[PDB]
C-alpha cells in the first residue's frame, strides 16, 4: 500500500482520461462550453500529480478563516448589489466559520443579533436590511444565523407571533407561498417557510395545507424539481423541494426513484463536482444543493425500510466531490468559488464547505463512517442536510422553541 505522505486520487487515475466529453463530432454551444471547462480542469488536476508522488490535499482553513472574519464587519461598495441580502451575508459567513470550527467571539455574536433585530419587520419576518420589507429568503438566512449563534439572546430576537402571521400573509390557496408581499412564487418559498416555522415551533395544522401536493407538482419528467410546475429540474429548487417535504414528513409525495436517478446523474464524470441541471456546467455551490439531496434521500428511503441502502456511504462519489472542491474550488487568497477562473465570494464559500462536509461524513442510525480526503485537518464540522446549520444547533434551537407555545394556537 501507500506511505502516509502520498494519497492516490480518483481524478488522477490513468483511466480518468476516458471520462472526457464525447461530442460525437457534433459541436454545439453546450459541448464547446463543456469542453473548455474540462480542458481547464484537467490542467488543474495535473498540477497535483508528480508522477507517482501525490501529496495529500489541503483545505486552506487559515486563509478561508481570515477572508471570512474580514467580511463580517465592513465591505466595499462593490457589495452594493447585496444591499437587499445582508442577512445572507451573515448566514453565509457564520455558517462557513461554524464548519471550520472557528469560534464566534461574544462581541461579534451580540453585534450580529443587534443587526438582525434591525432587519426584523414589525409585520413579522426579516428584510434584506434595516427598514426593508420582509422577504422569506433573508427571513430564512436571519433565522439560521441566529440559530448558529444559539444564545438565548439570539433566539429571543425572533418575534414568533408576527413571524407566523407573516407566513399566513404569503400563503396561497394552491399550497404555494409568495416570497414576499406582492412577490413571486417558486419552490424556494416553501422551503424558507418550512425551515423557519419548524425551527421556531410555529407550525399550525393549517399553515402547510396543500404545500406537499404543490411541491410534488414541481417534480418533472426528468425526476428533479423545477421552480414552479412545468419548469426544468434544477438542483437549487430540488434541494428546496425535498428538504421542505422532509420537514413536513411528506417525502413520499414524490417519485423518489426518478429523483434519485436524476440527482446522481448530475455528478460530472470528469470534473467530479455537480452541475445544476442536465447539460450545463459544474459549479462548486452544487456540492451542497445537489449532493445534499443524497442524505435526504437516504433518510427517506430508510424510513420506508429499504433493505438495499448502504450502511457506510451516500449514493454519490464522495471522494470525487472532495477532489473537485479541494483542487478546483479554493482561492489561494482564501475563500472558495464556482469553478477555476471565477472570483471567490461568501456564497460559494458557504456552499462549497457545506458540500465538503456532506462528502466527508456519513451517518445513519448508529452507523457513522467518515471519509476525509487529504490531511486529517481537512475534516469539517458536520452540517444538518435539511437546515444547513450544525446538527447541534438544530437540536438546541428546536429544543428551546418547543418550550414555547405555537402563537395563539393550543
Amino acid at each position: 500500500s501507500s506511505p502516509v505522505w502520498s494519497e492516490p486520487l480518483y481524478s488522477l487515475r490513468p483511466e480518468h482520461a476516458r471520462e472526457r466529453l464525447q461530442d460525437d463530432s457534433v459541436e454545439t454551444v453546450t459541448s464547446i462550453e463543456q469542453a473548455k471547462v474540462e480542458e481547464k480542469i484537467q490542467e488543474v488536476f495535473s498540477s497535483y500529480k508528480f508522477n507517482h508522488l501525490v501529496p495529500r490535499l489541503v483545505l486552506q482553513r487559515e486563509k478561508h478563516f481570515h477572508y471570512l472574519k474580514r467580511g463580517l464587519r465592513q465591505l466595499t461598495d462593490a457589495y452594493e448589489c447585496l444591499d437587499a441580502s445582508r442577512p445572507w451575508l451573515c448566514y453565509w459567513i457564520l455558517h462557513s466559520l461554524e464548519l471550520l470550527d472557528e469560534p464566534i467571539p461574544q462581541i461579534v455574536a451580540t453585534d450580529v443579533c443587534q443587526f438582525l433585530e434591525l432587519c426584523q419587520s414589525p409585520e413579522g419576518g426579516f428584510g434584506g436590511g434595516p427598514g426593508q420589507y420582509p422577504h422569506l429568503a433573508p427571513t430564512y438566512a436571519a433565522v439560521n444565523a441566529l440559530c448558529i449563534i444559539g444564545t438565548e439572546e439570539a433566539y429571543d430576537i425572533i418575534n414568533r407571533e408576527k413571524l407566523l402571521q407573516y407566513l399566513y400573509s404569503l400563503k396561497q390557496p394552491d399550497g404555494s407561498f409568495l416570497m414576499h408581499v406582492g412577490g413571486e412564487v417558486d419552490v424556494r418559498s416553501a422551503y424558507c417557510a418550512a425551515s423557519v416555522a419548524s425551527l421556531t415551533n410555529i407550525i399550525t395544522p393549517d399553515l402547510f395545507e396543500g404545500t406537499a401536493e404543490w411541491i410534488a407538482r414541481c417534480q418533472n419528467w426528468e425526476g428533479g424539481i423545477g421552480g414552479v410546475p412545468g419548469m426544468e429540474a434544477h438542483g437549487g429548487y430540488t434541494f428546496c423541494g425535498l428538504a421542505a417535504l422532509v420537514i413536513l414528513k411528506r417525502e413520499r409525495s414524490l417519485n423518489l426513484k426518478s429523483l434519485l436517478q436524476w440527482v446522481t446523474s448530475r455528478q460530472m464524470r470528469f470534473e467530479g463536482g455537480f452541475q445544476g441541471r442536465c447539460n450545463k456546467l459544474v459549479d462548486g455551490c452544487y456540492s451542497f444543493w445537489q449532493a445534499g439531496l443524497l442524505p435526504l434521500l437516504h433518510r427517506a428511503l430508510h424510513a420506508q425500510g429499504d433493505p438495499a441502502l448502504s450502511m457506510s456511504h451516500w449514493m454519490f462519489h464522495q471522494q470525487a466531490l472532495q477532489e473537485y472542491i479541494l483542487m478546483c474550488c479554493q482561492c489561494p487568497a482564501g475563500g472558495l468559488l464556482d469553478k477555476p477562473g471565477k472570483s471567490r465570494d461568501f456564497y460559494h464559500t458557504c456552499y462549497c464547505l457545506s458540500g465538503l462536509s456532506i462528502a466527508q461524513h456519513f451517518g445513519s442510525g448508529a452507523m457513522l463512517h467518515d471519509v476525509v480526503l487529504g490531511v486529517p485537518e481537512n475534516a469539517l464540522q458536520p452540517t444538518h442536510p435539511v437546515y444547513n446549520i450544525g446538527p447541534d444547533k438544530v437540536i438546541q434551537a428546536t429544543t428551546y422553541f418547543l418550550q414555547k407555545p405555537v402563537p395563539g394556537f393550543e
Binding site: 452594493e80 447585496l82 444591499d83 437587499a84 453585534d111 443587526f115 412577490g183 412545468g230 446523474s265
Partner: protein, 315 residues
C-alpha cells in the same frame, strides 16, 4: 429625466425640488456588521428613498426616484414593490412602463425582480402581444435563461398561446440539440396540448427522440426525454424498444444506453416478465459494468440498484 451616469446628474440632496423633505439615513446600529461602505451616489438615492417610503409619498418625484434606486440595485424588492404602488396610485401609462422593463431586463436578464415586474404588467394590461418575441430575443442571447423560460411558460399557459411553440422548440433543438431547457419546453408543450396518451403522438415523439440519439448518441438530454415520456406507463410496456436498443448495444455501448437497459430490466422484473432469472442476471451484469467500468462516478448508485434488484427479485 436624468440618468444616474449622465454628465448632468445631480445628487438628490442638491435638488431644489427635493428641498422640502429630509433624507432618512440607514441605522445600522452602533456596532455595524456586514456594513457596506456605500458610494456617495448610492447612499444619497437610498436616503431619499427611505424618506419617501417612510412618508408613503405617492408622487411623481418618488416614482422617478425609484428608477434611480433600481439602477443602483435592481435586486431591491422593496423599491420594486413601491414602484408598483406608485404605478397604480399615479395611474401611470403601463405601455411606457413595459418599454422601461424591456430595457431593464435586456441589461439584467438574470434577476428575479425584473421578470416578476414584467409579469405584473402583463397581468394588469391583459396584453401578452409582445411577450413571445421579447422572450425569444432574451433566449437568443442565452438559450438557457431560467427566468426567461419560466416567464414564457406562464405567458403561454395564461393566455393560451400554444399554436406556434412546438415549431419554436424545433428551431432551438436544431440550433443546440443539447439544450435541456428546450427538451423541457417540448414536454411542457405536448403534455398541455395533445397529451402523450394519443399513441400516434407518442410514436412521433419516440421516433423523433431516437433519431436525435442516433445523430448525437452521447447527448444526455435526448436519453432523458425518451425515459421521461415512457416511464409512467412503465418502460417494460414497450417491448420493441428493448430490441432496438439491444441491436444498438455492440456498436454504441454508451453509459446512457446501458443505463436505459437496466431501467427497462428493472421495470420488467416489477411486472412478472417471463425468464425472470435471465433478466435478473442480465441486469446485475450491467450494474457491475456500469459501477466498475462505464459509469464509475455512479458506482454507489449502481451498487445500490444491484442490491435493490436482488432484494425484490431473487427467490
Amino acid at each position: 429625466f436624468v440618468s444616474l451616469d449622465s454628465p448632468s446628474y445631480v445628487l438628490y440632496r442638491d435638488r431644489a425640488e427635493w428641498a422640502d423633505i429630509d433624507p432618512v439615513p440607514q441605522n445600522d446600529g452602533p456596532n455595524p456588521v456586514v456594513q457596506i461602505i456605500y458610494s456617495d451616489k448610492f447612499r444619497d438615492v437610498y436616503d431619499y428613498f427611505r424618506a419617501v417610503l417612510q412618508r408613503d409619498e405617492r408622487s411623481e418625484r418618488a416614482f422617478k426616484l425609484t428608477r434611480d434606486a433600481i439602477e443602483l440595485n435592481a435586486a431591491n424588492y422593496t423599491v420594486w414593490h413601491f414602484r408598483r404602488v406608485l404605478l397604480k396610485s399615479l395611474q401611470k401609462d403601463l405601455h411606457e412602463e413595459m418599454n422601461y422593463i424591456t430595457a431593464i431586463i435586456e441589461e439584467q436578464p438574470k434577476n428575479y425582480q425584473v421578470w416578476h415586474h414584467r409579469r405584473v404588467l402583463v397581468e394588469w394590461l391583459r396584453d401578452p402581444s409582445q411577450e413571445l418575441e421579447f422572450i425569444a430575443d432574451i433566449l437568443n442571447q442565452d438559450a438557457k435563461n431560467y427566468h426567461a423560460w419560466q416567464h414564457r411558460q406562464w405567458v403561454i399557459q395564461e393566455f393560451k398561446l400554444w399554436d406556434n411553440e412546438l415549431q419554436y422548440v424545433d428551431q432551438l433543438l436544431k440550433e443546440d440539440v443539447r439544450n435541456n431547457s428546450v427538451w423541457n419546453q417540448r414536454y411542457f408543450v405536448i403534455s398541455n396540448t395533445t397529451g402523450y396518451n394519443d399513441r400516434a403522438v407518442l410514436e412521433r415523439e419516440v421516433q423523433y427522440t431516437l433519431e436525435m440519439i442516433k445523430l448525437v448518441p452521447h447527448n444526455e438530454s435526448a436519453w432523458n426525454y425518451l425515459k421521461g415520456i415512457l416511464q409512467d406507463r412503465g418502460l417494460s410496456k414497450y417491448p420493441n424498444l428493448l430490441n432496438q436498443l439491444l441491436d444498438l448495444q455492440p456498436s454504441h455501448s454508451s453509459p446512457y444506453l446501458i443505463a436505459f437497459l437496466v431501467d427497462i430490466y428493472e421495470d420488467m422484473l416489477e411486472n412478472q416478465c417471463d425468464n425472470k432469472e435471465d433478466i435478473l442476471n442480465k441486469a446485475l451484469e450491467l450494474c457491475e459494468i456500469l459501477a466498475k467500468e462505464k459509469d464509475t462516478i455512479r458506482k454507489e448508485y449502481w451498487r445500490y440498484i444491484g442490491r435493490s434488484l436482488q432484494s425484490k427479485h431473487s427467490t
